[PDB]
């Protein structure tokens, strides 16, 4: 049985990592009903968008949502993890970020307080994540210049 959207937000990181598809779905099934415009097709043409800037304003909100999706898919793309929800990398874990052991992290902490504890070094980790790939780019570069 599945706890529902964001159900494991108070669960251990391992339990939420088991239901990450659940959190992944609310990125799409909020935006499937709005792009549908099936219940919007007939109601006063296109919900009277003439002299109603809330209609455009509403539309701009829909744009922000798909724009955020594109930000996350871009990050998964430049880290070579586009197709997968869980991917391992080559970046070693610098201990200065967090000193907690594996058992304490995955069976004693929630993703919220973890993201709060590591929000300080997120940019650095992303930099290593954008950098580390670059050594794969370079190995492919060796295969390119023969």
């Amino acid at each position: 049985v599945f706890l529902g959207f964001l159900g494991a937000a108070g669960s251990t990181m391992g339990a939420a990592s088991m239901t990450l598809t659940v959190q992944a779905r609310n990125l799409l099934s909020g935006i499937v009903q709005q792009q549908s415009n099936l219940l919007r097709a007939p109601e006063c043409q296109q919900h009277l968008l003439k002299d109603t800037h809330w209609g455009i304003k509403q539309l701009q909100a829909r744009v922000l949502a798909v724009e955020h999706y594109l930000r996350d898919q871009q990050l998964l793309g430049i880290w070579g993890c586009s197709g997968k929800l869980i991917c391992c990398t080559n970046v070693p874990w610098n201990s200065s970020w967090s000193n907690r052991n594996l058992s304490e992290i995955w069976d004693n902490m929630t993703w919220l307080q973890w993201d709060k504890e590591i929000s300080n070094y997120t940019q650095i980790i992303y930099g290593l994540l954008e950098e580390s790939q670059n050594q794969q780019e370079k190995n492919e570069q060796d295969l390119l210049a023969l």
Partner: nanobody, 128 residues
Framework: QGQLVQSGATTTKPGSSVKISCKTS????????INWIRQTAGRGPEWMGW????????????????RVNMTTDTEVPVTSFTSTGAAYMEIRNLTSDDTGTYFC????????????????WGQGTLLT
């Protein structure tokens, strides 16, 4: 980061019932279990039981199975990841051999095999 405060000590003659209060802070009271353990003077200290503040499920040693009643007060929220609560411990029949030091402790991890294992202890109390 958490703290476990324990009630004041008191000496009562055998035959009557008593109550120990263990007040919590500095963590999420519903996250970690609550254990009660006694240090016997003259023999080896013995674990007594544990209870979940959230699930409410309780499991005691057979040495105190039908002689102990545990209760957990509903946690009081403090921070986004810190709450405060109260844990209560009870004994039905008192005797002279019940004399010894008592402690309340919290759990180490939230899941896994070492879930209810005592980690952070209280200052302790003395008896008759």
């Amino acid at each position: 980061q958490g703290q476990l405060v324990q009630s004041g000590a008191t000496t009562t003659k055998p035959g009557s019932s008593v109550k120990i209060s263990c007040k919590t802070s500095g963590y999420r009271f519903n996250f970690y279990h609550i254990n009660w353990i006694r240090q016997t003077a003259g023999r080896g200290p013995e674990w007594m039981g544990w209870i979940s503040p959230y699930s409410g499920d309780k499991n005691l040693a057979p040495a105190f199975q039908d002689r102990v009643n545990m209760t957990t007060d509903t946690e009081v929220p403090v921070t986004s990841f810190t709450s405060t609560g109260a844990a209560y411990m009870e004994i039905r029949n008192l005797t002279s051999d019940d004399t010894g030091t008592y402690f309340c402790a919290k759990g180490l991890l939230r899941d896994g095999s070492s879930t209810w294992l005592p980690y952070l202890w209280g200052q302790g109390t003395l008896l008759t």
